[PDB]
Structure 1
């Protein structure tokens, strides 16, 4: 009859409007589950999906503070359009102005307090460091808040959450594998991380990705990983993602011990992603603790095997953009890392903080960072690394004495930009492979090729090759000049060719009687002045190496 036919020809879906609880709907479901009414959940409410492969389509809100916990979803299950919202409207800070300047003054930040589920974030203890003095100034009702509405996927394999959004919203994958957060539809975050893959118990996380989408706000980091290892296959990480205004960092791999084990991460991808206006860092890809580090690594490689900041993290890191960080645009540690195509621009905080060793950085741009001067540098590298291509300086000036690059053990090539050379500190800087060269000078009456020996002086050029106009701009004539520093006066001693279009070489001479050791090489002469006879003499080192003094020019 009809019922036999109908059962064969129609798509199966249950809808939440037909059930008193979410578990009742889950139990009834076979293929589809439609969330077609707002659902108020209690923190810790747990739904058992019976191992079923379900296509969950959300067209309403899950409303609650705390965690709505999904369990026992079958591999291939998908959850689309989820919207999490807290019941509580907390107090939030908004540490930026109507012209999008960061507020750094604690009292100014306190003045921004409002009750809202968005457009700011709940203070946490990290704000006490970020805005010194704010701990004392914040009213009690703005401290210690803990509002998040979290969808928790617990101990599932092969589950994807697509187009998720919300207000004071979080997404937690706890003990999951081969799960993805795809095309996040700009959830506005709460107290906890917005997207978290946490694998502190069970097998190391693997196959876990953030792909596409974006998030805004949140008190802490937007996308974060604990105890994930993508394997040599690099099966996990963050690709195609945007984070705006993280209360901590945009993308974070955790460092150090959490609970009783390692929170660290290996072999993940961080590519094609953007972090804008994080309160702390753009990308924080470190694994070992920075300040006050642990002396051990329970559940990970021991310090005896790999010293602090020298783990073989092996992440695949490429094509990242940060703008507007208040902390550090791009931070990492590790040994033997390859990093490419990183652009950090227009940051109040520093551009890069790299606790790396035997690592290679290719095509890095650090442009107008440390704009507030809270840090000692714009890019720092601790260990012995190679930088191949480094763009420095946009349009911002720097007032004080802070370095631009401090990479004292690194070998660097390919700096471009209007960098102040006194603010470069590297182990070695070289352009070994340039072709024939031309120095083109605009807005000056001369062109210059200068030399600076940083061991002698970081602030003064030690010699130069100049070309200078003779006469007016239409003269068709210039003089070439070779100079050397003396008494810390650049260009103090020089030889000239064609000064005043004279077609001759002007040769400097020793202004008094030359000592024997003033001459360096054999078969050379050094002119010197004999004032008592109004004569030039020549100190000559003969071809055989012996010295003789001759008369060179006389009245």
Structure 2
């Protein structure tokens, strides 16, 4: 029987049969079943001998600190891991029972409680976010560092599926071609919830976050350090959801970490959602010398050829900035940002294109100077502004924009050039008003007053079948001060404005034209005429 059995059954070793995780690992050949809770000590390391194993977790790993898995064979997969700290830390909860953000340090301090979820351990960035809190927090709530972390170290082709936990963290250190798939809403701890760190060895590649969901955590939910997806864009975040990040939903690190660059290139950031982060929805910047990276003499600050593939992202309820990034020659598309407390988008980009961007009701707490800020010479094609709420809305000094929609206040727009070059035949439709209008505003003259208009006003009331058209010009900072009318009171004639006094030679502009003016002392209308030959002559036009 032994021979028959050895050839017909699936091999799998189970934790309940061994005293330590390493004993189970050494015995493993194909599958490995975690069938009983295991208390690990921080730094406990397991060597898997290069075996390609399938780890099925049906119990939890308990402990503060890291449980390090090493030498897992390419193709290995861990499913259902549950990480839980042994410590129940002090957590703050900066939001109310109506889901309103609390921004007052005292009100935030009052939310203190010992829990492994539904809040997060204060971190030094909170001292900045809620000014004064550093002084108000009791010593036992400061400097906490609890996280139950599964650290996958220097492995390749290892995937972690349906992970979860309380005060949980997942760290891939020096890994390549690894994936965090369908994270089953782990509640984060002090550290990042999903981190791909490649500060040593080669630049990380093939590392992805696919289809997850995370909640809380003191810092960013998903973060990358020194990763480069290459031209193939092999790496990034796709179909992921982040709830209530203590810092940001997804973040690519900036600047120098240790003695090398922590920046990232050629990653995908698509079809993902970030809701209610204490800081940003997406923090895709690289710059904040650059050892280990491009020199400033080659690429100035904020002008790195990051080349990320960014598309179809949704952000809602950030206390900070909805979407932020930097870079040169970037193409960004289909971004939707709604109901944020800080800027909806903060863009330190140059020579980049933004297509179909919707920034709806953001900067609601006036944390910044505008709803959307663009640094360099960029192009925006399709920009939706204003939802249900009423600083500048958009300040993009060197950018050319087209296709803005929404109830934006014109005085709150600052761009280099705004234009609709390719519209077809047009119709202005007016509702709930006695007139329709097409207004012109030269922002160089005034950002608050229209300089001229073409109106249509009703004569009589509804259903009269009559209206008058008037062409206006501003004078003395009084809009519509001067104007020519056609059909006022259904008279069917043109009412024409004349100079109220003797017209000066320079008033008339073109040849073959005449400018009527008033001669009060003779009660006559005169006409300054500039003949077709350019010569001026004054004629009598109308008299008693």
With structure 1 as the length reference, what TM-score do the two structures score?
Answer: 0.98
Give the equivalent residue in structure 1 for 2:542.
Answer: 553
CA distance in 2, matches of 1:511, 1:339: 56
CA distance in 2, matches of 1:466, 1:500: 15
Give the equivalent residue in structure 1 for 2:507.
Answer: 518
Deviation at 1:195, TM superposition (A): 0.1
Mapping 1:455-534, distance limit 5 Å: 455-534=444-523
Cα deviation, 1:303-352, whole Å, max 9, x if unaligned, reads 00000000000000000000000010000000000000000001111100
Deviation at 1:200, TM superposition (A): 0.2
Cα deviation, 1:73-127, whole Å, max 9, x if unaligned, reads 0000000000000000000000000001100000000000000000000000000
2:23 aligned counterpart, secondary structure: helix
CA distance in 1, matches of 2:18, 2:491: 102
Give the equivalent residue in structure 1 for 2:141.
Answer: 142
Deviation at 1:368, TM superposition (A): 0.3
CA distance in 1, matches of 2:29, 2:453: 81
CA distance in 2, matches of 1:435, 1:465: 18
Of 371, 383, 392, which aligns to 1:390?
383
CA distance in 2, matches of 1:498, 1:142: 76
CA distance in 2, matches of 1:439, 1:462: 19
CA distance in 2, matches of 1:491, 1:153: 71
Deviation at 1:248, TM superposition (A): 0.1
Q: How many residues align?
A: 544
CA distance in 1, matches of 2:374, 2:190: 32
2:344 aligned counterpart, secondary structure: strand
CA distance in 2, matches of 1:502, 1:285: 63
- Does 1:367 pair with 2:360? yes
Cα deviation, 1:215-241, whole Å, max 9, x if unaligned, reads 000000000000000000000000000
CA distance in 1, matches of 2:531, 2:16: 107
CA distance in 2, matches of 1:433, 1:501: 35
Divergent runs of 4+, >2 A: none
CA distance in 1, matches of 2:354, 2:309: 12
Cα deviation, 1:225-273, whole Å, max 9, x if unaligned, reads 0000000000000000000000000000000000000000000000000
Deviation at 1:549, TM superposition (A): 0.4
Cα deviation, 1:514-555, whole Å, max 9, x if unaligned, reads 000001101000000000000000000100011000001101
Deviation at 1:213, TM superposition (A): 1.6
Deviation at 1:22, TM superposition (A): 0.1
RMSD: 0.3
Give the equivalent residue in structure 2 for 1:292.
Answer: none
CA distance in 1, matches of 2:527, 2:15: 104
Deviation at 1:471, TM superposition (A): 0.3
Cα deviation, 1:444-467, whole Å, max 9, x if unaligned, reads 000000000000000000000000
1:404 aligned counterpart, secondary structure: strand
Deviation at 1:301, TM superposition (A): 0.2
CA distance in 1, matches of 2:132, 2:501: 65
Deviation at 1:190, TM superposition (A): 0.2
CA distance in 2, matches of 1:529, 1:544: 25
CA distance in 1, matches of 2:493, 2:187: 75
Deviation at 1:474, TM superposition (A): 1.5
User: Gapped runs of 5+ residues in structure 2?
Assistant: none
CA distance in 1, matches of 2:98, 2:139: 29
Cα deviation, 1:469-495, whole Å, max 9, x if unaligned, reads 000112110000100000110100000
Give the equivalent residue in structure 2 for 1:8.
Answer: 7
2:468 aligned counterpart, secondary structure: strand
Give the equivalent residue in structure 2 for 1:535.
Answer: 524
CA distance in 2, matches of 1:264, 1:128: 25
CA distance in 2, matches of 1:504, 1:523: 23
Deviation at 1:438, TM superposition (A): 0.3
Cα deviation, 1:127-159, whole Å, max 9, x if unaligned, reads 000001100011111110000000000000000
CA distance in 2, matches of 1:100, 1:544: 75
Give the equivalent residue in structure 2 for 1:314.
Answer: 307
CA distance in 2, matches of 1:159, 1:492: 74
With structure 2 as the length reference, what TM-score do the two structures score?
Answer: 1.00
Mapping 1:131-530, distance limit 5 Å: 131-289=130-288, 296-397=289-390, 402-530=391-519
Deviation at 1:468, TM superposition (A): 0.3
CA distance in 1, matches of 2:134, 2:498: 69
CA distance in 1, matches of 2:528, 2:24: 104
Cα deviation, 1:380-401, whole Å, max 9, x if unaligned, reads 000000000000000011xxxx
Deviation at 1:504, TM superposition (A): 0.4
CA distance in 1, matches of 2:137, 2:542: 84
CA distance in 1, matches of 2:55, 2:452: 73
CA distance in 1, matches of 2:137, 2:359: 35
Deviation at 1:373, TM superposition (A): 1.0
CA distance in 1, matches of 2:212, 2:153: 22
2:126 aligned counterpart, secondary structure: helix
CA distance in 2, matches of 1:443, 1:131: 45
Cα deviation, 1:396-415, whole Å, max 9, x if unaligned, reads 11xxxx00000000000000
Deviation at 1:374, TM superposition (A): 1.2
Cα deviation, 1:265-294, whole Å, max 9, x if unaligned, reads 0000000000000000000000000xxxxx
CA distance in 2, matches of 1:205, 1:328: 27
